[PDB]
Design a binder for these strands. Structure first.
Length: 49
DNA sequence: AAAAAAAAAAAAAAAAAAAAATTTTTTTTTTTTTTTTTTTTTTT
């Protein structure tokens, strides 16, 4: 808990993802607009962290 | 000297020209939602 607070950028999660947030990133096509939406997990949401 | 022809000016009428002018509805598109199939994942 403290180390997450004290890093410049840091994210403290569980192995089992998080509440409405994964752990690894995922990317998925959107059939309507065809854009590959990129759900950001802890690993990428704290890149450089 | 009187008559008359011509001139300019003024007016009426018919043909052409001038001018004025937003609102309502429909359809594509995007975006989600729902059903049902397919796929994948957990159990004995």
């Amino acid at each position: 808990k403290f180390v997450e607070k004290c890093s410049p950028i840091g994210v403290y999660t569980s192995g089992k993802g998080s509440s409405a947030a994964g752990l690894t990133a995922s990317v998925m096509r959107d059939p309507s607009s065809r854009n590959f939406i990129m759900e950001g997990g802890a690993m990428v949401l704290a890149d450089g962290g």
